[PDB]
Design an enzyme around this catalytic site. Structure first.
Site, PDB file in Angstrom:
ATOM      1  CG  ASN A  32       1.727   0.250   8.269  1.00 29.89           C
ATOM      2  OD1 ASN A  32       0.934   1.133   8.010  1.00 29.89           O
ATOM      3  ND2 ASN A  32       2.301  -0.566   7.549  1.00 29.89           N
ATOM      4  CG  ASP A  58      -0.300   0.040   2.584  1.00 28.53           C
ATOM      5  OD1 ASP A  58       1.042   0.178   2.624  1.00 28.53           O
ATOM      6  OD2 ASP A  58      -1.265   0.162   3.630  1.00 28.53           O
TER       7      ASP A  58
HETATM    8  C1  LIG Z   1       1.735  -2.947  14.179  1.00 27.50           C
HETATM    9  C2  LIG Z   1       0.950  -2.100  12.906  1.00 27.50           C
HETATM   10  O1  LIG Z   1       1.293  -1.238  12.854  1.00 27.50           O
HETATM   11  N1  LIG Z   1       0.106  -2.969  12.462  1.00 27.50           N
HETATM   12  C3  LIG Z   1      -0.593  -2.506  11.299  1.00 27.50           C
HETATM   13  C4  LIG Z   1      -2.307  -2.374  11.477  1.00 27.50           C
HETATM   14  O2  LIG Z   1      -2.574  -1.499  12.725  1.00 27.50           O
HETATM   15  C5  LIG Z   1      -3.121  -2.138  10.416  1.00 27.50           C
HETATM   16  O3  LIG Z   1      -4.308  -2.688  10.664  1.00 27.50           O
HETATM   17  C6  LIG Z   1      -5.383  -1.413  10.727  1.00 27.50           C
HETATM   18  O4  LIG Z   1      -5.088  -0.954  11.973  1.00 27.50           O
HETATM   19  C7  LIG Z   1      -6.233  -0.002  12.035  1.00 27.50           C
HETATM   20  C8  LIG Z   1      -5.590   1.032  13.328  1.00 27.50           C
HETATM   21  O5  LIG Z   1      -6.058   0.085  14.490  1.00 27.50           O
HETATM   22  C9  LIG Z   1      -7.369  -0.559  12.311  1.00 27.50           C
HETATM   23  O6  LIG Z   1      -8.607   0.354  12.323  1.00 27.50           O
HETATM   24  C10 LIG Z   1      -9.240   0.362  13.706  1.00 27.50           C
HETATM   25  O7  LIG Z   1     -10.276  -0.703  13.225  1.00 27.50           O
HETATM   26  C11 LIG Z   1     -11.190  -1.336  14.602  1.00 27.50           C
HETATM   27  C12 LIG Z   1     -12.178  -2.195  14.061  1.00 27.50           C
HETATM   28  O8  LIG Z   1     -11.515  -3.306  13.495  1.00 27.50           O
HETATM   29  C13 LIG Z   1     -11.632  -0.051  15.228  1.00 27.50           C
HETATM   30  O9  LIG Z   1     -12.319  -0.397  16.253  1.00 27.50           O
HETATM   31  C14 LIG Z   1     -10.778   1.440  15.285  1.00 27.50           C
HETATM   32  O10 LIG Z   1     -11.533   2.551  15.507  1.00 27.50           O
HETATM   33  C15 LIG Z   1      -9.883   1.368  14.120  1.00 27.50           C
HETATM   34  N2  LIG Z   1      -9.031   2.502  14.517  1.00 27.50           N
HETATM   35  C16 LIG Z   1      -8.772   3.833  13.761  1.00 27.50           C
HETATM   36  C17 LIG Z   1     -10.025   3.720  12.535  1.00 27.50           C
HETATM   37  O11 LIG Z   1      -8.113   4.590  14.037  1.00 27.50           O
HETATM   38  C18 LIG Z   1      -7.745  -1.286  11.021  1.00 27.50           C
HETATM   39  O12 LIG Z   1      -9.011  -1.933  10.963  1.00 27.50           O
HETATM   40  C19 LIG Z   1      -6.737  -2.239  10.533  1.00 27.50           C
HETATM   41  N3  LIG Z   1      -6.918  -2.629   9.281  1.00 27.50           N
HETATM   42  C20 LIG Z   1      -6.785  -4.099   8.788  1.00 27.50           C
HETATM   43  C21 LIG Z   1      -7.044  -4.560   7.456  1.00 27.50           C
HETATM   44  O13 LIG Z   1      -6.647  -4.679   9.737  1.00 27.50           O
HETATM   45  C22 LIG Z   1      -2.529  -2.822   9.114  1.00 27.50           C
HETATM   46  C23 LIG Z   1      -3.257  -2.438   7.770  1.00 27.50           C
HETATM   47  O14 LIG Z   1      -3.145  -1.131   7.374  1.00 27.50           O
HETATM   48  O15 LIG Z   1      -1.016  -2.688   9.033  1.00 27.50           O
HETATM   49  C24 LIG Z   1      -0.423  -3.043   9.981  1.00 27.50           C
HETATM   50  O16 LIG Z   1       0.926  -2.963   9.613  1.00 27.50           O
END
Ligand SMILES: CC(=O)N[C@@H]1[C@@H](O)[C@H](O[C@@H]2O[C@H](CO)[C@@H](O[C@@H]3O[C@H](CO)[C@@H](O)[C@H](O)[C@H]3NC(C)=O)[C@H](O)[C@H]2NC(C)=O)[C@@H](CO)O[C@H]1O
Ligand SMILES: [Cl-]
Ligand SMILES: [Cl-]
Ligand SMILES: [Cl-]
Length: 129
Positions: free
Chosen positions: A59, A48
Site C-alpha cells: 500500500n 482512502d
Molecule cells: C500489505 C499492505 O500494504 N497492507 C496495508 C496495511 O499495512 C495497512 O494497515 C495499517 O498498517 C500500519 C503499518 O503497519 C499499521 O500501523 C501499525 O499499527 C500497529 C498496531 O496495530 C503498531 O504496532 C505499529 O507501530 C504501527 N506502525 C506504524 C504506526 O508505522 C496500522 O495499524 C494498519 N491499519 C489498519 C487499519 O490495519 C492498511 C490500512 O492502511 O492498508 C493495507 O493495504
C-alpha cells in the site's frame, strides 16, 4: 509477469519468506493468489486515495511512494512502481518489513479473510521446493 503457483513458491522460498516471522510458505502463496492473482503488475486503488501495488498488493499510504497519496509514509523507501517488476525482490524485502510491524500477516486483508486459519499447505502441493 503472471507467476505460476509453484514458480512463485520457489521464488518466495529463495528470498527467505518460508517461515519468515513464523508464516509458512503456503501463507505467502495464498496471500499472493488472493491479493494479485499472482500478477506482478496488479494495481488497485483504495477509498482512502492510496493504491496497492504488485504481487503482494503493498500500500502507498504506508510502504511505498507513488506521488499521489497525501500524508503518506514510504517506510520501505521504494517507488511503488518498483513493486511491479517481474523480479519479486523489492516486494519481498518490503513484505518482510510489513509483517514485522506488529499485526503480522493481518496487514494483508485478503490473507486475513481468505487464508488465515485455512489449509494453506495446499498452496504448495506438487511443488519441488
Ligand atoms: C500489505 C499492505 O500494504 N497492507 C496495508 C496495511 O499495512 C495497512 O494497515 C495499517 O498498517 C500500519 C503499518 O503497519 C499499521 O500501523 C501499525 O499499527 C500497529 C498496531 O496495530 C503498531 O504496532 C505499529 O507501530 C504501527 N506502525 C506504524 C504506526 O508505522 C496500522 O495499524 C494498519 N491499519 C489498519 C487499519 O490495519 C492498511 C490500512 O492502511 O492498508 C493495507 O493495504
Ligand atoms: Cl505451508
Ligand atoms: Cl490502479
Ligand atoms: Cl504473528
Amino acid at each position: 509477469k503472471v507467476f505460476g503457483r509453484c514458480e512463485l513458491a520457489a521464488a518466495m522460498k529463495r528470498h527467505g519468506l518460508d517461515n519468515y516471522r513464523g508464516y509458512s510458505l503456503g501463507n505467502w502463496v495464498c496471500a499472493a493468489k488472493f491479493e494479485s492473482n499472482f500478477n506482478t503488475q496488479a494495481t488497485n486503488r483504495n477509498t482512502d486515495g492510496s493504491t496497492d501495488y504488485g504481487i503482494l498488493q503493498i500500500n502507498s499510504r504506508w510502504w511505498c511512494n507513488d506521488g499521489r497519496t497525501p500524508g503518506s509514509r514510504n517506510l520501505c523507501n521504494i517507488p511503488c512502481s518498483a513493486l511491479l517488476s517481474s523480479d519479486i525482490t523489492a516486494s519481498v524485502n518490503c513484505a518482510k518489513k510489513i509483517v514485522s510491524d506488529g499485526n503480522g500477516m493481518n496487514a494483508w486483508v485478503a490473507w486475513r479473510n481468505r487464508c488465515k486459519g485455512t489449509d494453506v499447505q495446499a498452496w504448495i502441493r506438487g511443488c519441488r521446493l
